[PDB]
Amino acid sequence: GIHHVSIKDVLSKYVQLLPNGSSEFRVVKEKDGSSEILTENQVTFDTKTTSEGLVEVTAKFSPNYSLEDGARYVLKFTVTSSQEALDAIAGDKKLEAGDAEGSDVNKLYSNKGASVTYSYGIGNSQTKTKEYSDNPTFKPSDPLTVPVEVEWQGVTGARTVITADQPSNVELKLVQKNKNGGSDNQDYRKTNVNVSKNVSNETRNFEKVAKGYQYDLIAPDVPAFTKEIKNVGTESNPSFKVIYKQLPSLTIKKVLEAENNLNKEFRIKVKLTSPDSKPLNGTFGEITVVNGEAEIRVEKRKRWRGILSYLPRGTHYKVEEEAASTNGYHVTYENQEGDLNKDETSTVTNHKLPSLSVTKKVTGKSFKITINIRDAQNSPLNGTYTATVNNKRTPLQFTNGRASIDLNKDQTIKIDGLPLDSHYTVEEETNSSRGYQVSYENQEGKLDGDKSATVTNNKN
């Protein structure tokens, strides 16, 4: 028989062996319809790198083993597509001459030469090498397609109306992660996803994506929205969803009550802090925040409001009108303080403080009149208020609820800036009223806007 047999295959760059002898090298002897596996004492397998960097597999029969007449001996082993084959079928690598039958990526050669060497004869034998004439071809598996979905949410979640400006499209890029030390290819595939008003979800797919790599996605930062990118598939079958969710805004409104002068301006301060307690800085709409502080100037031309557009989710806000802007007003607040998790409106109301006017009438000498005022909480007034008689402005001071004025016939004093919802009584002093019958109009009353009391002094 023939002896000193060896079978050799040189594998192309398009295939490779499996890890850890999973290739399961074996030589089967087939004769008369029976099959048996040569043992380790009958054959040895070696793997080597050739000088051109290819893997060469040899089955070396034990040297004195002779092939049985008419038996088929067949070397079997498994290979898998190399990265090169997976790249070529995704269209990421050009073929060169020799790579595949008719340069078709569905017909990559598995071998770059294969042959058998053997000897025959007793004594000084003869040695022959024959090349296999078959050049088999294979098709790697289909490349991937990778779905990508873009979803737009309003401030309070999916399907909720969006109010912010949106671009007309978003360019999405599939990033092929480098697995051999190099840099990620961040432009591996790209797609433009249409963006239309009130269409929340739109889908595209990257085509012919090479297997063998991990992938990620780049999607643009869109002003007014936060961006979340998820792989809703697996590592080996990625599928991506980008969610753009509109950021919340804080509107500060000013309301005037009982105030006929609409030309005033007011400064309203807003304090803005993060849950983490980093100082907040940035420009939000028209309103710049420095170190957690912003100041909004409201007037009629701006519709009595300012907007901090697209603040970070969960920002703590506290609204306060500046002290100088509160003079002459009772100032109340709605939604003064909170956490910004949806759009919020914070309202400052400036209710002009009421005044009390007292007129002296004489029918038929200065007359002394006492004014008692108790505040909204029922406590006697103490403080000094501007009072005007005939365009002379004087301070009028209340002590323990009481002030006194002096009026001539037909004079009016008007006392400004008194507390909202306080109660007044006026009473002419006994000495002033001697010789006169005294009558009153609106002797008592509630300071819930401008009031007028009249003291009437009728001789006798």
Binding site: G1, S110, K130, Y132
Partner: peptide, 30 residues
């Protein structure tokens, strides 16, 4: 000298993507 015939094939392994079995044979007649 003995006559030898050589056949080489590659076959996809059914139900396993990207896996193929190579077969390199030799038969000898006296």
């Amino acid at each position: 000298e003995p006559q030898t015939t050589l056949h080489k094939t590659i076959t996809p392994i059914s139900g396993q993507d990207d896996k193929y079995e190579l077969s390199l044979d030799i038969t000898s007649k006296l």
